[PDB]
Design a protein around this ligand. Structure first.
Ligand SMILES: O=c1ccn([C@@H]2O[C@H](COP(=O)(O)OP(=O)(O)O)[C@@H](O)[C@H]2O)c(=O)[nH]1
Ligand SMILES: O=c1ccn([C@@H]2O[C@H](COP(=O)(O)OP(=O)(O)O)[C@@H](O)[C@H]2O)c(=O)[nH]1
Ligand SMILES: OC[C@H]1O[C@@H](O)[C@H](O)[C@@H](O)[C@H]1O
Ligand SMILES: OC[C@H]1O[C@@H](O)[C@H](O)[C@@H](O)[C@H]1O
Ligand SMILES: [Mn+2]
Ligand SMILES: [Mn+2]
Lengths: 276, 276
């Protein structure tokens, strides 16, 4: 297998940070040779599970989400979609590529948007089925579309994704939970990045750990009369501060061209918000 | 725990490649916050085994090697030195820091320098003792001294170290084995880096795999009447081409100031050749 030689005195990207201070790759276009990664992951017959909640009106987002995932998400690898919905008959029948399957998991609807978004951690953690069926789990919002490659480069024991509104910001600007009353509490002088709750994942074991931890933390907050400021994302950020991810995705992986344009530092816009 | 904020639009190092195309960190000063890594590794009570062969005249190199390892190598972590020698009474008694131990393993001497260097793979692979006693194994030459920090930043499932004579070179210049007759054979259009046999390591499982593979490959070459051009290092390079390391050490970790000076791109010279 023949490819460009990496040269150690020629960096790929000089414009962005491509490794965290705990030596986790930060995933940008030009940092990876996908042909190498694809080979490595195919040699293990990797199966990737993709979880998405479509509760209430959000079933409307599934057709574009799944169609575009078929075009861009882990193409060539085994993929198992898990669609959590209160409306199984509303899941569109989208034609899938070979090695790809979809399961519909019927769940209850909470009235409040905070609990729908928040009880995802609980819903994800359903535990023995993921362990037997997939190697990795990827957990994303449904109001999104894939516009470019999202592949095995993201796979690692634990990853989070840089929030597109805060990647160029200083930590005191991060909208972490700042009340010491909350399990999600992070002091003003702490913090690596501000991760978005819309795209995280890892090995099935590490995702079950994270989601269990976040759920346990939110129940503690509830039994104490406090709701973290950005809810699941607050707790996600506290978890990833204390258990550092082994890869970080750049904002190529979570973007909104309408709000933020297409800056030169983003060579690809891979997974983006749908207008709502 | 309070530290400088990484900023994603300010890279650490813009002068060197800090991640390989398969997303393994390349370990340079300024890429890592050691306080973070130290915490992570201490939380697992990590034990690092360091193997060194001192056969014949090479026992003379042990005092400086061990004294300087006490100053710089994994300080604060548990360390088990394994000294393979034909002369147990010649191992100097060096005073060790707390949590550090040394074992002397008596082995036979081969007459030829090629077989002394080459049979290390066999000698390392002695298998159940490493699995029970250490988490990682680091395998180095003895004619060396530590001059600066060599710590848990290097630890990963599998690592190799960039040969200091070839890091700025193109692959056709690499002195890989070029005869298809040899198990170590690498074609002219293949190859990522040229790794030095003087410094490799990983988890005990991955080092046992590598050393078993290299030994099996060299026995095949022997039963076929060919000796790879740079011996163990040829086979090391073939193994690491096909099983890509999960970290690569920069030449800060294997250098010779007498032959190569102190170039600006090396902010630290950590482990260096002793005149011989
Ligand atoms: O009525 C709702 C509200 C939220 N969600 C799920 O929870 C996710 C996060 O909520 P949302 O996308 O509304 O949050 P935002 O991106 O606006 O902050 C959604 O993508 C859906 O997967 C849902 O299914 N139905
Ligand atoms: O007579 C010898 C020759 C080699 N070695 C071991 O094999 C390693 C590699 O050999 P050497 O350092 O001579 O190779 P070089 O760096 O010169 O290529 C040495 O560091 C020792 O650990 C040894 O113990 N005794
Ligand atoms: O937490 C800061 C917030 O950033 C907003 O831009 C986003 O819409 C919210 O979902 C939340 O992530
Ligand atoms: O393989 C090329 C060679 O490079 C030399 O500089 C070194 O002394 C040898 O041990 C070998 O590594
Ligand atoms: Mn959303
Ligand atoms: Mn040597």
């Amino acid at each position: 297998m023949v490819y460009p030689q990496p040269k150690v005195l020629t960096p790929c990207r000089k414009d962005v940070l491509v490794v965290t201070p705990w030596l986790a790759p930060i995933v940008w276009e030009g940092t990876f040779n996908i042909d190498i990664l694809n080979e490595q992951f195919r040699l293990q017959n990797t199966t990737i599970g993709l979880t998405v909640f479509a509760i209430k009106k959000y079933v409307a987002f599934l057709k574009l989400f799944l169609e575009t995932a078929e075009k861009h998400f882990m193409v060539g690898h085994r993929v198992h979609y898990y669609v959590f919905t209160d409306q199984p008959a509303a899941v569109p029948r989208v034609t899938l590529g070979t090695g790809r399957q979809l399961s519909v998991l019927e769940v209850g609807a909470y009235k409040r948007w905070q609990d729908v978004s928040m009880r995802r951690m609980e819903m994800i953690s359903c535990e023995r089925r993921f362990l037997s069926e997939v190697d990795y789990l990827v957990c994303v919002d449904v109001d999104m579309e894939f516009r470019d490659h999202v592949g095995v480069e993201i796979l690692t024991p634990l990853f989070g994704t840089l929030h597109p509104s805060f990647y160029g910001s200083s930590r005191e600007a991060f909208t972490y939970e700042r009340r010491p009353q909350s399990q999600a509490y992070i002091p003003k002088d702490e913090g690596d990045f501000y991760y978005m709750g819309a795209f995280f994942g890892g090995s099935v074991q590490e995702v079950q750990r994270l989601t269990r931890a976040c759920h346990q933390a939110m129940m503690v907050d509830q039994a104490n009369g406090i709701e973290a400021v950005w809810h699941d994302e607050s707790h996600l950020n506290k978890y990833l501060l204390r258990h550092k991810p082994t890869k970080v995705l750049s904002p190529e992986y979570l973007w909104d061209q309408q709000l933020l344009g297409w800056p030169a530092v983003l060579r690809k816009l891979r997974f983006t918000a749908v207008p709502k």
